Amino acid sequence: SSGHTAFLKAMLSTGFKIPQKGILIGIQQSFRPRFLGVAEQLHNEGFKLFATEATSDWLNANNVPATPVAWPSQELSSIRKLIRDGSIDLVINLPNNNTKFVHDNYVIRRTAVDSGIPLLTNFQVTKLFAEAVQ
């Protein structure tokens, strides 16, 4: 494979650029309790949050606004379309053992990297990305 327009634009970046638009949130259902706090914090900082339907509804039900998106396999807007037109400039995709979503998660991570979008796949990092008031 190769990278294209989105990727080249990323190679022109400085390295200090911090996401501003929206954040796609992908997490295993069972990890919801611990993540809610980080989500709320990201929201309270001006980020628009996007998540797969079930997760988006859970977020909203817990005072954290979020827009639902469809799983690539179940194509609710398309994740690639959002990443493609700049609505999502950061992707949080943490481990998920659900067989039903393993490929979708692979595809989501690959789409982010292919377009030079920062990808957070560890909760530690993600955890500080929010507290840092960043």
Q: How many domains does the chain have?
A: 1
Identify how the structure was determined. X-ray
Q: Is 55 annotated as a binding residue?
A: yes
Q: Is 97 annotated as a binding residue?
A: no
Q: Is 60 annotated as a binding residue?
A: no
Q: Is 63 annotated as a binding residue?
A: no
Q: What CATH code is carried by the domain that includes residue 44? A: 3.40.50.1380
**Structure tokens of 58?**
């859970």
* Type of residue at 108: I
Range of the domain at 61: 1-134
Sign of CA dihedral 124, 99, 69, 28: negative
How far is the C-alpha of 112 from the C-alpha of 26, rounded, in Å?
A: 12
**Structure tokens of 5?**
């327009």
* Type of residue at 123: F
Angle at CA of residue 95, ends 92 and 99, nearest 5°: 120
